[PDB]
Design a protein around this ligand. Sequence first.
Ligand code: HEM
Length: 400
Amino acid sequence: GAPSFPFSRASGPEPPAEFAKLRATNPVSQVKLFDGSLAWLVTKHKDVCFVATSEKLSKVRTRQGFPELSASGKQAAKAKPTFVDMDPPEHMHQRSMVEPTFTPEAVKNLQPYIQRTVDDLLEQMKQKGCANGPVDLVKEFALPVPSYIIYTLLGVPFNDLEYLTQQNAIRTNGSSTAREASAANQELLDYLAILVEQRLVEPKDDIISKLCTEQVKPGNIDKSDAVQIAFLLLVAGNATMVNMIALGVATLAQHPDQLAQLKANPSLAPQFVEELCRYHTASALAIKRTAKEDVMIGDKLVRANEGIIASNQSANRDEEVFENPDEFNMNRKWPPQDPLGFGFGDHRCIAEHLAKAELTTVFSTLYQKFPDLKVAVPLGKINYTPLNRDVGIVDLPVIF
Ligand code: HEM
């Protein structure tokens, strides 16, 4: 029978072993989801791009055969959708309401603020020190950098950042009870609703205010929609950002020649970030569709109302695109084809430029501030996310 999916990672920092075998012998195959239903799994870079762009495929989760991967996903699919789950024309109708903050030009103009945020958190880490033992690079740095930035862009005032960063972390922490995670989720929604009310009365220079002035007041969306769009922008990428920062530090510890390169030349940070986003595809479960009509993919017929999962993680290890794909090599010569860490097509991560700027700022600054930063536990004992989840690191003891 069809194997259960998601697959488990082969070890803490490695992709599932199944993908390499599937790319070689069965690149479009059926898998069994948590509820016993079947879905198609696509593993080659070319086919992942096809799935991401075909207008014969839908992200609408109320369609028959949509590949929800858990009971919580089936429950979430009942809610009113935001643009992440929309097809044209609704998708860009709503996404364009918030895209301006995320353009290359806007993200370039944000660079001094990104740098200040990273610098301030590094200085707080220095002042706290590690004189009594290792400290957790996740809690002290990888968590607040993306959290403070997206909260600030949305419109949260500075004094509220630390508490709301902690609450949003509780939401997804693997140690939280269900009650604890649900209470933190509702606290974030309650806070955002009050912020939307405030910005309807007195808008400021932030994303929520722009939604209020330009879409809520004119009746293009309502205020509960504005809350949900803001919430999507917070929760869609934050855990992935935290994991990418921590994975970057661990990857450099595992590759000491490349770390020494980066310590000696911070202008290598962009190249490092490109290879990191290919090699550790920390969001690998989001390119999902159902077929609106029959569609042929490779040697398979995907029938109408059948589900599809396109693994951008597998695509990023596709030997036919990336030479020596399972080596981390920030000095590689890149091919014509895009790495797919941020997806592809109309739904490609709205925050791709922001995320790369955050990551480039982190890795061009971290080892200037802390040239002796070391992972404090043996690398084989790093606390990775559980193997049946997206790759990530829960906590990362360091000294400096
Ligand atoms: C290194 C960090 C990140 C990675 C690797 C990442 C990756 C991804 C991927 C793989 C997708 C799916 C794209 C597709 O459907 O083809 C996506 C979509 C999305 N991401 Fe991210 N992301 C990151 C950071 C962020 C951040 C910081 C935000 C918000 C500020 C964000 C918000 C979103 C949203 C809203 C979508 C849905 C876009 C749409 O369907 O139109 N992501 N991201």
